[PDB]
Amino acid sequence: DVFLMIRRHKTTIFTDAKESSTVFELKRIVEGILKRPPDEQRLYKDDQLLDDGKTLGECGFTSQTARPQAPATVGLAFRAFEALCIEPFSSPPELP
Template sequence: MDLFFEIQRKKTHIFCDAKDSSTVLELKKVIEGILKIPTGEQTLKKQADDQAKTWETLDDAKSLSDCGFSTLNAKAQHPAVVALCLVKDGQAEDVMIDPLSTPPPLPDVMRAQEGGQGSDSGTN
């Protein structure tokens, strides 16, 4: 299955997709191809808890599905957020994400798709 990601660092936001069987290292290789940052200098993190805003480091050897990503939380219309942190002197920097502008509302067609997932598709 295809999973969709928004990889964020400061004002850089990269949208990409990957198979659920792909590893975190393969996702890093996609980033390397775009930003020219070697995989060894990258650390990828996902939010561990929405309330506390804590981040957990993703293991390069694990598949994306083993890291908790699925078609339910990594959709094309709502990609999973992954933070990119650079490694300097063996230490990964803190998560730094600058917000972008607010996107326009979803079209009715996409809202209908999310309606089956328990969203607010009944409101206009």
């Protein structure tokens, strides 16, 4: 019951995982979606690296901080290392 928004430069992937899951599952998922093998992509969290070993339960993706109505963003970088260059969303208009 954790919801994540995996972020490329512009590409965003809306993924759902169990409360007890690790990084390898998300790597397999983004391999199945982006057609990129996991050996050249590493996930992130608020612009700091994450390892393939530890689980998302203690990684900071708690059920009350990654609810489906407001999922937590996750970085994604592909080897062509390249730094995280996530482009933010559009600027909302001011109140009329």
